Design a protein around this ligand. Structure first.
Ligand code: ARG
Length: 581
């Protein structure tokens, strides 16, 4: 009859192939969508094919009587134990315990838990992007964390991921900095960096000559004089040096050679504007050079002339945005570019990208995705600041996270050696910072809350990290013949075992969603449901105290895969785990 095509597929994908073939065999067109999704309730099975009503409508027939025809052609032997029609023509699919058992075994044998590798793409990820004329702060936090989760996920799926740290390394803010560095290091001659920034502004307002000199040092830097360009590289180098040790504390995969600031695109800008003119897209308007876009309206209600070069001849964010996308396709050969940027930048991005398309700088087959996010708020519902109202240093936020975590872990003692107790607070504190962000739909405005993010109740990092330790504590090496276990089979007999196994095998399709939508909160929700299913499994099914050796070994393997899945999943979020707590 009908056969499988290609290689290894996850359960949802395999079922889709099978249901599609049955639909086609029943008369459905070759572009039919079975819409197989995980069931909401377990009386409805593990999966449901929901695409029947839409298919029946198109062929112009009753879904209830079409579903019975599709059932006739549907072959889930060795995959589904039971398949029945429900309601208006739903297809409830109950997974075969033998099918699940073999895939649990195959997952355990694999270092990546049997997660298939998708067709490899080159993916650029734009995130973090701190202003390097000052110490990194909370305003750059969400982008750094969410973007790095996307990076980790795409890398684990075997993609070529290019981290692009679009740092703000070319503002007027440097004129003051360069002036101060000269007034010291030169004419006068990492711990001074914090004294540096403040002492720079300390003369910005108390010396007319200095603050005038600072404004024209911007010109000299923009002129291309190698003297000021070298002093500029130096203070960027030392700032990124301070930023690296903060990234490290954050457990973020960003390094020095991921830095691609807007200064990198500067020598490209005149070429872009000149080329956009040559294409007849850019024309003069009120002294400025604009591109007219039909998709946008100005304040006058007229078609918007997007400025790519202004009257004084200077460029702006749009021009860099254009050059940036072009560069990422032409030089980096991106198949896909992801921008983790605050949602208020949407229109700016859409404008610049609309020009990118018109010029044909980036083919339409290469998506430019704005993975936008809400802003960090306080309890007041207003932008995030301290007790008074100054911008929050990331280095300070991390400091308090560790200090609060040391106390929170000292609450339940739990008494352990000194070094291990340090690693424990670090995992909990920083884990909480990152997880509290990641566990929420990025698009939503995020309200920072110390009490909730560090609680052992609900979907938080400390809960996840604790649940992981309880999973480990049942797998006691000293009481397990590991060679006998590794050779032992998985035998799924109870509904809770089958539920856990099936959920464990949905690790791949969770990753598939995260990679596609750029939404790590789907991963957070999965792990939490997984931890919950294990608990129900733990409290209802004797593991170490199982009645016989076959069940003991089988349930230990389920526990083993649960541990591996929780640790790998948390790793894709960039969350550290500990052995015990
Ligand atoms: N392509 C860019 N302009 N990237 C910089 C965006 C800034 C950063 N992603 C943020 O919103 O926190």
């Amino acid at each position: 009859h009908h056969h499988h095509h290609g290689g290894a597929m996850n359960i949802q994908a395999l079922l889709s192939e099978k249901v599609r073939q049955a639909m086609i065999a029943a008369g459905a067109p070759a572009d039919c969508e079975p819409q197989v999704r995980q069931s909401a309730k377990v009386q409805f099975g593990d999966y449901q094919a929901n695409g029947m009503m839409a298919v029946a409508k198109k062929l112009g027939m009753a879904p209830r009587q079409l579903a019975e025809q599709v059932l006739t052609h549907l072959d889930l032997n060795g995959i589904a134990s039971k398949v029945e029609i429900a309601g208006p023509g739903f297809i409830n699919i109950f997974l075969d315990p033998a099918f699940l058992a073999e895939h649990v075994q195959q997952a355990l044998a694999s270092d990546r838990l049997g997660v298939a590798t998708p067709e490899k793409q080159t993916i650029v990820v734009d995130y973090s992007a701190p202003n390097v004329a000052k110490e990194m702060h909370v305003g750059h936090l969400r982008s750094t964390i969410i973007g790095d989760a996307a990076v980790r996920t795409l890398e684990f799926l075997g993609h070529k991921v290019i981290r692009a740290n679009h740092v703000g390394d070319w503002g007027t803010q440097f004129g003051m900095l360069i002036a101060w560095l000269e007034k010291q290091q030169q004419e006068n001659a990492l711990a001074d960096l914090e004294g540096f920034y403040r002492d720079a502004k300390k003369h910005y307002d108390e010396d007319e000559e200095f603050a005038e000199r600072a404004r024209n040092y911007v010109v000299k830097l923009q002129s291309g004089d190698e003297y000021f360009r070298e002093m500029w590289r130096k203070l960027v180098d030392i700032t990124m040096t301070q930023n690296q040790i903060t990234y490290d504390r954050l457990n973020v995969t960003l390094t020095r050679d991921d830095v691609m600031g807007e200064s990198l695109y500067n020598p490209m800008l005149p070429g872009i504007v000149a080329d956009l003119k040559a294409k007849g897209l850019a024309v003069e308007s009120e002294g400025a050079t604009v591109v007219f876009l039909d998709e946008f309206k100005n304040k006058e209600g007229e078609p918007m002339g997007v400025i790519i070069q202004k009257k004084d001849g200077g460029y702006l964010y749009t021009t860099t945005d254009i050059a940036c996308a072009k560069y990422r396709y032409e030089t980096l050969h991106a198949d896909r570019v992801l921008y983790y940027i605050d949602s208020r930048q949407h229109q700016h991005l859409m404008q610049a990208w609309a020009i990118v398309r018109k010029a044909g700088y980036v083919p339409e087959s290469v998506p430019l995705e704005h993975h936008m996010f809400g802003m960090m708020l306080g309890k007041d519902g207003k932008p995030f600041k301290t007790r008074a109202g100054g911008t929050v240093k990331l280095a300070d936020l991390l400091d308090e996270a560790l200090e609060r975590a040391r106390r929170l872990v000292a609450e339940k003692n739990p008494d352990m050696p000194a070094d291990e107790l340090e690693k424990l607070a670090n995992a909990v504190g920083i884990g909480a910072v990152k997880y509290a962000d990641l566990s929420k739909n990025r698009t939503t405005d995020y309200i920072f809350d110390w009490d909730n993010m560090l609680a052992f109740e609900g979907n938080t990092a400390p809960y996840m990290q604790y649940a992981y330790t309880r999973v480990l504590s049942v797998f006691r090496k000293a009481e397990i013949d590991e060679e006998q276990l590794a050779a032992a089979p998985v035998i799924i007999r109870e509904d809770r075992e089958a539920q856990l196994a099936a959920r464990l095998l949905q690790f791949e399709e969770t990753l598939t969603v995260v990679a596609r939508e750029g939404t790590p909160h789907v991963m957070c929700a999965y792990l939490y449901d997984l931890a919950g299913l294990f608990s129900g499994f733990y409290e209802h099914c004797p593991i170490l105290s199982a009645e016989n050796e076959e069940v003991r070994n089988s349930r230990l393997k389920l526990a083993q895969l649960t541990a591996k899945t929780l640790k790998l999943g948390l790793d894709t979020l960039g969350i550290e785990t500990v052995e015990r707590m």
